[PDB]
Amino acid sequence: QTRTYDGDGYKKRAACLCFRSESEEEVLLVSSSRHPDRWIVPGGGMEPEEEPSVAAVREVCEEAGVKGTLGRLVGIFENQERKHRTYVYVLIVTEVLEDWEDSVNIGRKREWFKIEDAIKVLQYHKPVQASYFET
Numbered sequence: 001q002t003r004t005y006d007g008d009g010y011k012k013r014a015a016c017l018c019f020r021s022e023s024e025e026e027v028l029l030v031s032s033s034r035h036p037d038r039w040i041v042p043g044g045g046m047e048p049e050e051e052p053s054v055a056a057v058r059e060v061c062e063e064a065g066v067k068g069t070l071g072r073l074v075g076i077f078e079n080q081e082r083k084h085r086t087y088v089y090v091l092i093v094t095e096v097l098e099d100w101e102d103s104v105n106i107g108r109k110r111e112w113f114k115i116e117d118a119i120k121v122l123q124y125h126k127p128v129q130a131s132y133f134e135t
């Protein structure tokens with residue numbers, strides 16, 4: 001659970017865009033922990049000496065209960081207001097697990113969204129996560 005930081009003091013995070021297929025038309029979002037009626041892109045803190053691609057796959061297993069084929073690094077995204085820096089990867093989902101860590105522990109929810117709808121639900125509270133999809 002040890003948080004890690006870049007040299008400028010930003011928290012290091014990693015996340016995946018968890019697509020249903022290689023056509024990248026539908027993405028899996030998970031409920032906010034603070035506010036369960038809102039949606040976020042699953043992701044979280046890198047552990048010490050943990051590769052960003054390893055952290056990304058690990059956090060989406062913990063938070064979303066999915067596994068799959070790791071794809072490209074999309075980019076590195078800062079949240080200036082919250083002082084964190086996130087590596088965002090494509091993941092093509094091949095396994096959907098029941099009773100995953102956050103479902104059991106905090107009743108976290110997950111749902112497939114068409115890309116345009118994911119951008120819509122992220123915009124108000126998570127505009128940087130909406131920007132993950134701009135490419």
Ligand SMILES: O=P(O)(O)O[C@@H]1[C@@H](OP(=O)(O)OP(=O)(O)O)[C@H](OP(=O)(O)O)[C@@H](OP(=O)(O)O)[C@@H](O)[C@H]1OP(=O)(O)O
Nearest residue numbers: 003011013031032033034035040043044045046059082084
């Ligand atoms: O509980 P998570 O994992 O879904 O995510 C939380 C962040 O947790 P994060 O996803 O970064 O880490 P992890 O707990 O490793 O997933 C946490 O970050 P932290 O600062 O480390 O407590 C951040 O706080 P902020 O960085 O102060 O804006 C918010 O609590 C955020 O809650 P959400 O986006 O409403 O679900």
Ligand SMILES: [Cl-]
Nearest residue numbers: 021024025026
């Ligand atoms: Cl898809």
Ligand SMILES: [F-]
Nearest residue numbers: 044045059062
């Ligand atoms: F976490």
Ligand SMILES: [Mg+2]
Nearest residue numbers: 043044059063
């Ligand atoms: Mg997490």
Ligand SMILES: [Mg+2]
Nearest residue numbers: 042043044045
């Ligand atoms: Mg998280």
Ligand SMILES: [Mg+2]
Nearest residue numbers: 001044045059
């Ligand atoms: Mg974590």
